[PDB]
C-alpha cells in the first residue's frame, strides 16, 4: 500500500496473508470459516495447496494464526494478459473458530450501492513504492471508487478496464495498492456498519499515479461463481 498507515491489530478481521513457501505472497479475505477470496494471479507460478499457508494477524513476521490450505480454485476464464476474471478461492483444511479479531467480511449484493467517488479501504502487506519490497505489518489506505468510464479515459487505461473490474484511487494520487497487495480486499460498510468486500486488488500501471488508479476485480460480477464454488451467498 502506497500512502497508507499501519493498520491496528483487529481492525481488519477478515484479512489474511497467503504465504507461498513460507513468504508472504498475496492478500486474501475470509468470506466464511473455511474459504478465502483472493486473486487468480497469486497462483500463476504455484497452485499447489500444500505449498500455501494462510495467516491472520497484522504481522507476517510474527503471525497470530497459521492455517493450512486444502484446495486452490482459479476462475476458469482467468486471462493473465488482460487481467480478466482475476479471482480465486482458497479452501482451508480446518474451519476457523471466529473471534472479534478473526472473522469474515460480507459479500456484496448483486445490486450493492457502490457509487462513483465513494470512499473505501484497501489493505495489505504490499510495497510502498512500485515493485519495491513488501512490508512486515499490514497497511491500510482510504481511496475513492473511480467509475470504469473515467478509468478508461485515453490518458488513463484507454479501454483496458472491463466490466468485471473496478478502479479506485485518490484525487491527488499517492494512495494505492502496490506489488504484494494482490488478492487483498477493497471494502465499504453499509448503514448498519456491516463491511462488504467490493473489490479484490488486481493490477495497475505502476502505483499511485493520479492518471492510473488501481484496478480491482469487481466482486459483484462473481457472486454466482463464488456461490457455485463454495455454497456461500450474501
Amino acid at each position: 500500500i502506497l500512502g497508507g498507515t499501519e493498520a491496528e491489530e483487529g481492525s481488519w478481521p477478515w484479512q489474511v496473508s497467503l504465504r507461498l513457501n513460507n513468504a508472504h505472497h498475496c492478500g486474501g479475505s475470509l468470506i466464511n470459516n473455511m474459504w478465502i477470496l483472493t486473486a487468480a494471479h497469486c497462483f500463476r507460478s504455484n497452485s499447489n495447496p500444500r505449498d500455501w499457508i494462510a495467516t491472520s494477524g497484522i504481522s507476517t513476521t510474527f503471525p497470530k494464526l497459521r492455517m493450512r490450505v486444502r484446495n486452490i480454485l482459479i476462475h476458469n476464464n482467468y486471462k493473465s494478459a488482460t487481467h480478466e476474471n482475476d479471482i480465486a478461492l482458497v479452501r482451508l483444511e480446518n474451519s476457523v473458530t471466529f473471534t472479534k479479531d478473526i472473522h469474515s467480511v460480507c459479500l456484496p449484493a448483486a445490486t450493492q450501492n457502490i457509487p462513483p467517488g465513494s470512499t473505501a479501504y484497501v489493505t495489505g502487506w504490499g510495497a510502498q513504492e512500485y515493485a519495491g519490497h513488501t512490508v512486515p505489518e499490514l497497511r491500510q489506505g482510504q481511496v475513492r471508487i473511480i467509475s470504469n468510464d473515467v478509468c478508461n479515459a485515453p490518458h488513463s487505461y484507454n479501454g483496458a478496464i472491463l466490466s468485471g473490474m473496478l478502479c479506485a484511487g485518490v484525487p491527488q494520487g499517492g494512495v494505492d495498492a502496490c506489488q504484494g497487495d494482490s488478492g487483498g480486499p477493497l471494502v465499504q460498510e453499509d448503514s448498519r456498519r456491516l463491511w462488504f468486500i467490493v473489490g479484490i486488488v488486481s493490477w495497475g500501471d505502476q502505483c499511485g499515479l493520479p492518471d492510473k488508479p488501481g484496478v480491482y476485480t469487481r466482486v459483484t460480477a462473481y457472486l454466482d461463481w463464488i456461490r457455485q464454488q463454495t455454497g456461500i451467498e450474501f
Binding site: 491496528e8 478481521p13 469474515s104 460480507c106 465513494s118 473505501a120 479501504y121 456491516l194 450474501f234
Partner: peptide, 15 residues
Amino acid sequence: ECGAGPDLITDDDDK
C-alpha cells in the same frame, strides 16, 4: 455472521 469491522467510517462527503 459476517461484516463486523472497525470503528472507522467511509464517509463520501469530506472535501
